Ligand binder design. Sequence first.
Ligand SMILES: OC[C@H]1O[C@H](O[C@H]2[C@H](O)[C@@H](O)[C@@H](O)O[C@@H]2CO)[C@H](O)[C@@H](O)[C@@H]1O
Ligand SMILES: OC[C@H]1O[C@H](O[C@H]2[C@H](O)[C@@H](O)[C@@H](O)O[C@@H]2CO)[C@H](O)[C@@H](O)[C@@H]1O
Lengths: 282, 278
Amino acid sequence: TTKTLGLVMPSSASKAFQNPFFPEVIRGISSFAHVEGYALYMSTGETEEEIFNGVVKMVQGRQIGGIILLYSRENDRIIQYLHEQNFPFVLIGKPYDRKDEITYVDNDNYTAAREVAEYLISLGHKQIAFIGGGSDLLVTRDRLAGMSDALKLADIVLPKEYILHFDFSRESGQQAVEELMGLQQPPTAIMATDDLIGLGVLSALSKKGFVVPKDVSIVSFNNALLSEIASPPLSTVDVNIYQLGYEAAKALVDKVENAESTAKCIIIPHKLLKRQTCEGHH
Amino acid sequence: NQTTKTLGLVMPSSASKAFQNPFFPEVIRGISSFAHVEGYALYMSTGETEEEIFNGVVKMVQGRQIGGIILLYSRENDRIIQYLHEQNFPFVLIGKPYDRKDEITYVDNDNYTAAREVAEYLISLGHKQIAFIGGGSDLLVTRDRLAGMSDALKLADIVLPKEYILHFDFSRESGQQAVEELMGLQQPPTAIMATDDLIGLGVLSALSKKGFVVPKDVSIVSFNNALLSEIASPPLSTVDVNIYQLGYEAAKALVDKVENAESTAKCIIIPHKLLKRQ
Ligand SMILES: OC[C@H]1O[C@H](O[C@H]2[C@H](O)[C@@H](O)[C@@H](O)O[C@@H]2CO)[C@H](O)[C@@H](O)[C@@H]1O
Ligand SMILES: OC[C@H]1O[C@H](O[C@H]2[C@H](O)[C@@H](O)[C@@H](O)O[C@@H]2CO)[C@H](O)[C@@H](O)[C@@H]1O
């Protein structure tokens, strides 16, 4: 037997490592793999087809004992594959369906986003926008869902033009600001589902001569080191990336070694850190 | 050599209504079932009053025989949790804990979701008025199951009276006096959600006693799939929470805590399932 664990990204390891979420999740993954003498393995394919092939060779090689998926996408072929080959794997993120069958690690993203939206609403904001990554990712749907419900519960409208999907990058944050700040009735607060987008939102808002947070409040997610040092420092939700990783690996090795298993879900705590990007609105 | 190997279950009062609730046998089933895999025996507290129980825990730790502790129930302002945390003693908790969720390891159902799910079901049947009977209010599970439903309705735009809301103690008797109370006002809801199978049973029987035909007159859903649930009348609408697995997953968690010095606090979430036999 060989103990190595496979890691699967949502895209090229090169795109992934530009996002500080990933080195931190891997850092948690590794910290545990160490405890049980497991090593790590990832494929290099950039393309979706290439990433599939990647996972397939992993399973075909009989050298990988288990696989951690660092993401959760709707209709992931990767999951259809692993489920059919009966290969041991674990999610970081809610699965679209079969919660009962799949073992996953996640934050309560629905509630984190609800809480962020409650936070802004208690601040008197009534025109609140959401900027996320892919629609097809479940962390995005959930984060959307929680802020959305929070708005409907306080009787606050959420127009289609305040909901944005882009990839997670700074540029995304800049195009969002173009779109949002370009409307006839723009938002006064903004929730970004990723610090990269937060950081970009900030620069873009500042290139246009706005001031955060007097003109626009921003909350974002993930606590990137960069968020601490942004000017002004970003309110963000710490989502405990490392523990997501550590706990994912601990769940997988258990699944692999025990080999008779029950599927559970593991919820790692989040924390809203209010730094400097939010101001009162009343 | 060198092995002791046993876990401590902080039991409810022997004279409490909770001891007799089916939730506990089933949770102990899970606990013993996993405990057996690692060869842990179970030791249980016998106290009746809150002080006696507290003493028991102090005895458990002090004796140094017992590896870790499971708290079967969740009390507010909790003293035992405080003492345990201070003694650096590994413990796990069935149910959400009001405070320090971040600092404790616990095992739960997504009760808020389940309640929402239940509500959306009834609406789909499309019931204008829905009422709620809960075990008394402080326990979180009640608060969450309340919130879940109260939200789905609000989203729905259905309205909750504050008379559709009740709160009395997890007893078959409790579910009796509620049916008498609820059919008491000018409007009868025609749907109900109860947070406990005992309550659900006294709800089915108190409206047999009044000449109301379930499901066609009044529709009922209740939690926990006691499986007293199957027996009762027409079989129910129930949310089955796999209590066995709560117990099992709680033990797995503690044994890990006991053996590997695992600090990290996480919530472990057991899947639920809305069966519908009304
Ligand atoms: O909340 C847990 C969450 O972690 C990961 O989500 C990442 C995402 O993949 C990254 O690209 C970046 O955008 O930040 C997210 C963290 O907030 C898992 O991919 C996701 O499935 C899971 O929900
Ligand atoms: O959802 C799991 C829920 O379980 C417990 O709640 C019990 C309660 O203790 C019983 O007396 C009765 O109300 O059945 C409930 C479960 O349906 C705990 O509160 C905790 O495990 C958790 O929140």
